Amino acid sequence: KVIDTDIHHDIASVDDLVPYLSDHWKRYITEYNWKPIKTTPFHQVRSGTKYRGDSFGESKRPPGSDFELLKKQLLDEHEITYGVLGGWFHEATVATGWFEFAAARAAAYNDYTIEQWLNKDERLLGSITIPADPVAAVREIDRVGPHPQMVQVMMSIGNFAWGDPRFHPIFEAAERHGLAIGMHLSADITFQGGEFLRYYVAWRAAHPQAYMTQVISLITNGVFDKYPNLKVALIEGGFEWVPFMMNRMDAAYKGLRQETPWVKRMPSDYFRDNMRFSTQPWHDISAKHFLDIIDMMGSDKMLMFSTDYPHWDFDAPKRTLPPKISDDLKNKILYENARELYNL
Amino acid sequence: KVIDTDIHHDIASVDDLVPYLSDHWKRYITEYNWKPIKTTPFHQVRSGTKYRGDSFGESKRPPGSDFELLKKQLLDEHEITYGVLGGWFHEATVATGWFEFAAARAAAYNDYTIEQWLNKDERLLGSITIPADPVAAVREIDRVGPHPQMVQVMMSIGNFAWGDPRFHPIFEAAERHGLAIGMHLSADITFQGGEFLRYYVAWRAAHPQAYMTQVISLITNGVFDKYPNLKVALIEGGFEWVPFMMNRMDAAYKGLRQETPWVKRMPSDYFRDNMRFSTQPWHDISAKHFLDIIDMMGSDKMLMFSTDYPHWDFDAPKRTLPPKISDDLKNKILYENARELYNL
Ligand SMILES: [Fe+3]
Ligand SMILES: [Fe+3]
Ligand SMILES: [Fe+3]
Ligand SMILES: [Fe+3]
């Protein structure tokens, strides 16, 4: 009855990666003291920062890194049929130097998911962590993509556009392996002139813009005309802006499609046929206003559920959707739209 | 019946500025052959580019640089009661160097608008062109803001955020003079990583994001708590995304408001009380979807109309709103909302 499309399991220590790195790269952790950097100059102004208070546990363990707490607190407690692990490994994809090392960690992150998460539970599905280098990412996708519980290539949203023709081999590898594209913000997003907007509360209100840029980038570069069977899940960008983007791009393309002649359809088509959007973070939306938005969308196949466990704005699956919506809709958003996406 | 809030008068050539510049800066046009730069690597793939086919006339004159044609084709032809001239002078405001000269051009642009446009027709109103530097921007507002037909300070949208405390002296100087803030895109907006997104059709699709950052920046830096009678006109960024941003910022703020303790109201109160949005460019929208957007806004006082004369996606007043809406809403969008905004 419910498929969770955004779960952030984690490593509890950078040392969890040493057992999967070649001996060259083991040194960067053991001897050269490599730690992952995040560039966001701010965070949630609350105790427990980005997490639920009850996700840390008693062993001082980073939330999301304890498999057993994941099982109890989320999979069992909230009756999850299938959870799509997102990871907390975006750092390797949005890395700004040491790209060779970054590719090594990508493979290392995926070994850790397969061996310490996917293989320990049938309800867990995985996303492939990739470096941004298209050659290495195709090489990683070919490596762990054949895995049966691997459903998604994770294109972490950074300060570049995935739909650029340089990354087109990565989409082809994912279609050649029956995978969807997941897309989730990273913490490094900046905006015009590269500024962070001074406050986390402002940065948080802005970052759906980066999601919007990626859908424009996928559509205008003809990614969906080249691979019309590829689907892309936008995870945690919201969805209330979606009818606006559909209308704007349709109107833009009615006058000017000759600039990108490889785009054969109307942009709102690729929204219905090739893209899914998570409902998290859910905000109090009346059932009248929610149904308006579905109607402005022209489909009920486009929304999916996610909890974002273990993050502070966690959404519980029986407490989020407006109660007055049809059970048919309720089941499509809670289960069917995702199940179709992941061939589940 | 109609107040047009986006009209783009222009100079015919950089020699129109020379009478209004000091001798020092005359030389930059006379001897050093200065020409404004725009950085956009693309434009509309169409004959006439960004302009209407009938806007050039037969003089080879730049569209919108011809007072008499603007009168016949726009003010008279479409029966405009008041036009808010927005100019095409954002280059001075979004200048990236030679700032001292940029201030001088700002004044010369305003001198041009006053002497050759505002003082030649009573249905015309003006925006104040400013340099970005807040000291000299205040100097210019003080100098030309007392002109009886100047209703707006033009805060041209580039690759920075106007809500920054750096700029608050400009906000204050507008309110002290009884002027609103206009906010219109530049040619020079980029996005994540400072990229342009390869095709003008993509760039068109994305530049509403920059409007989104401006309204976030205004709220979170407390511009409207500092000046609660100050109103801002987002002109040509669209409006169908207004509901999503009001709810996104309201959800953020319920939980994180102590980060910005100067923000005393709810974000969506500022949207209703402090912000006004243009309808251009108008995309077909059903009557019910349009009314659902207004219900979602919680106010019928936020939408205004503009033609965007002389650009290629010009809207005509008798033919843009949903033909099924009440005369009460039609008059509020076409006239009343702007008339309250500009104390007209
Ligand atoms: Fe997430
Ligand atoms: Fe989150
Ligand atoms: Fe305009
Ligand atoms: Fe325009």
Residue numbers in the entry:
A (entry chain D), B (entry chain F): 29 to 372
Task: Quote the authors verbatim.
Dinuclear monooxygenases mediate challenging C–H bond oxidation reactions throughout nature. The protein components of AibH1H2 stem from a largely uncharacterized structural superfamily, PF04909, containing over 100,000 unique proteins that can individually function as either carboxylases, hydratases, hydrolases, or monooxygenases. Representatives of the latter enzyme class—collectively defined here as “amidohydrolase-related dinuclear oxygenases” (AROs)—include PtmU313 and AibH2,9,15 which employ dinuclear cofactors with different metal identities. Herein we utilize this “guilt by association” strategy to identify four candidate AROs that can each harbor redox-active dinuclear active sites. Each of the four candidate AROs can harbor redox-active diiron cofactors.
The genomic neighborhoods of candidate AROs stemming from Litorilinea aerophila (A0A540VG95, referred to as SfbO), Afipia carboxidovorans (B6JH23), Cytobacillus firmus (W7L2Y2), and Geobacillus strain Y412MC10 (D3EI84) intimate disparate physiological functions. Each of these proteins was fused to an N-terminal His6 tag, recombinantly expressed in Escherichia coli, and purified as soluble protein preparations. For initial studies, the expression medium was supplemented with additional FeII sources to ensure the formation of an intact dinuclear active site. Aerobic samples of these Fe2-metalated proteins were found to exhibit moderately intense UV/vis features centered near ∼350 nm, consistent with charge transfer bands classically associated with diferric FeIII–OHx–FeIII motifs. These features were diminished upon anaerobic addition of ∼1.2 equiv of sodium dithionite (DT) and returned following reexposure of these samples to air.
